[PDB]
Ligand binder design. Structure first.
Ligand SMILES: CCCCCCCCCCCCCCCCCC(=O)OC[C@H](COP(=O)(O)O)OC(=O)CCCCCCCCCCCCCCCCC
Ligand SMILES: CCCCCCCCCCCCCCCCCC(=O)OC[C@H](COP(=O)(O)O)OC(=O)CCCCCCCCCCCCCCCCC
Ligand SMILES: [Fe+3]
Ligand SMILES: [Fe+3]
Ligand SMILES: [Mg+2]
Ligand SMILES: [Mg+2]
Ligand SMILES: [Mg+2]
Ligand SMILES: [Mg+2]
Lengths: 246, 246
């Protein structure tokens, strides 16, 4: 008997039953539903399907219960063991990459600039593929760790990310279809900031004006996480000042 | 956009989010939860897990919305293509089988005895295993089709079933563990009655006094589905009169 598992899991069970009754779900519908979720399970989409309708709500929760630079949903594509960089992120030399630059400061919720903070960054190849997770792509690519200096400053040069769709061929995709939504997410860059003394801050940031920023199939775009459009020497720039609490 | 999928699926999504907020589920809990359900998916327990907390409620629904001999949850172990029998069900000759006898009538909700109704029956080997689904067991065993005669009567001789537990080694088992329930179901026999003119009636029936009839881990035992204890010549007897609607 786990007090909390039994509080939260129970609350859900009790709550879904109600719907099963009120909406008057038939024997034949119930099968159709269960048959669906086994496909979802079969398709290894179990976590995905959850992430879409839920994870975004769970951020809205944490953002209420804490003081930090705006949080965002984490996403499936984070891999630990990213290489530390001065630096520049390792990216492919190819024509279709556009330079992106990321500057800023990591600091405490009490205001003190933190040094030796590790900023873990990952983002999509121009195709929408993440490294080491897609199509024979090296893991040291499009991933890296940034470490704030004596002033709590970090700067990194990298290629631009792109919007990508969650897998659209499966049960989740269509299910969104029936729900009048789509499979597309706006382009974003992934940050996880952890200082050995503080609570981890995981977030992603989008680009003002980018496609899908209005309609994110997951709901996890929020005004703060939209960066203004600023170029320097024809190089898109993100200036992000993180605040981790603790 | 499927009007109903979007009504019922939506209602659930909206309803689970509330819990995620109210109970104040953390980022770290959410993972733990999602991590759980992928195990459930990994363990091919996706349907099971649902059947336990839900399917029993879905009967309570149908039993409200229709006129029939009491319905019951279907269960995973029904296989179509059961052999028609006069008859007797094919069972193993072994010592530990106790004779069980099943008599009765199938009839319409308007009262007319139906003839040529097909009563599909399946039940557990003395071990708790179902045929063709367990341990190299022939499918013509512990399964059969009964066909009501000119009077709408059916009778079949068969071996006794036994209580069995839903798979207890996996994520569902323990999850019930945390919820203060168990893995055990009381002994029951499975009937599906379909006449080519009428709505299928699927139900199972338990034995008065049998273990677990009070505590069914799934909730799907109900007073009607408890048969009284009656022996004839030292042979347990079930007298069941089905009423299919339409
Ligand atoms: C194992 C849990 C996985 C995570 C669950 C997702 C978490 C939150 C989002 C889940 C969305 C709700 C799942 C409902 C899926 C319905 C599929 C469907 O309707 O197929 C359309 C279905 C067939 O089309 P399909 O989408 O290709 O399968 O439409 C039909 O023809 C039948 C009518 C469907 C109406 C059924 C209404 C919902 C009944 C489901 C009962 C079981 C719900 C248990 C889920 C509890 C969630 C905690
Ligand atoms: C894909 C859908 C499959 C069908 C879903 C089942 C349908 C109705 C029954 C579902 C029961 C609810 C599932 C919750 C499972 C919780 C697992 C757990 O707490 O592990 C204990 C977990 C670890 O132990 P474990 O059980 O071995 O994993 O306990 C912990 O240490 C962490 C605290 C757990 C508290 C989390 C509260 C629930 C958060 C889940 C958020 C996602 C819910 C989405 C489900 C929507 C359903 C429609
Ligand atoms: Fe991403
Ligand atoms: Fe059964
Ligand atoms: Mg600076
Ligand atoms: Mg600045
Ligand atoms: Mg008779
Ligand atoms: Mg009689």
């Amino acid at each position: 008997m786990d007090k909390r598992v039994a509080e939260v899991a129970g609350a859900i069970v009790e709550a879904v039953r109600k719907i099963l009754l009120d909406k008057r779900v038939t024997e034949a519908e119930y099968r159709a539903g269960v048959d669906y979720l086994t496909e979802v399970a079969q398709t290894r989409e179990t976590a995905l399907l959850l992430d879409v309708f839920l994870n975004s709500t769970i951020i809205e929760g944490k953002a209420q219960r804490s003081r930090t630079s705006a949080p965002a949903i984490q996403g499936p594509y984070f891999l630990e063991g990213a290489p530390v960089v001065e630096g520049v992120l390792k990216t492919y030399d190819t024509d279709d990459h556009k330079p992106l630059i990321i500057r800023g400061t990591v600091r405490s919720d009490t205001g003190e600039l933190l040094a030796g903070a590790v900023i873990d960054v990952w983002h999509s190849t121009p195709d929408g593929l993440y490294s080491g997770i897609h199509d024979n792509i090296p893991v040291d690519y499009y991933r890296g760790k940034l470490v704030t200096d004596s002033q709590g400053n970090y700067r990194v040069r990298t290629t631009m990310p792109v919007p990508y769709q969650i897998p659209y061929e499966g049960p989740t995709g269509r299910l969104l279809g029936h729900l009048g939504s789509h499979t597309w997410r706006p382009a974003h860059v992934h940050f996880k900031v952890r200082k050995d003394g503080f609570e981890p801050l995981t977030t992603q940031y989008y680009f003002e004006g980018g496609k899908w920023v209005d309609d994110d199939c997951c709901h996890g775009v929020t005004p703060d996480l939209i960066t203004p459009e600023t170029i320097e020497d024809g190089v898109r720039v993100m200036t992000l000042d993180f605040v981790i609490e603790r």
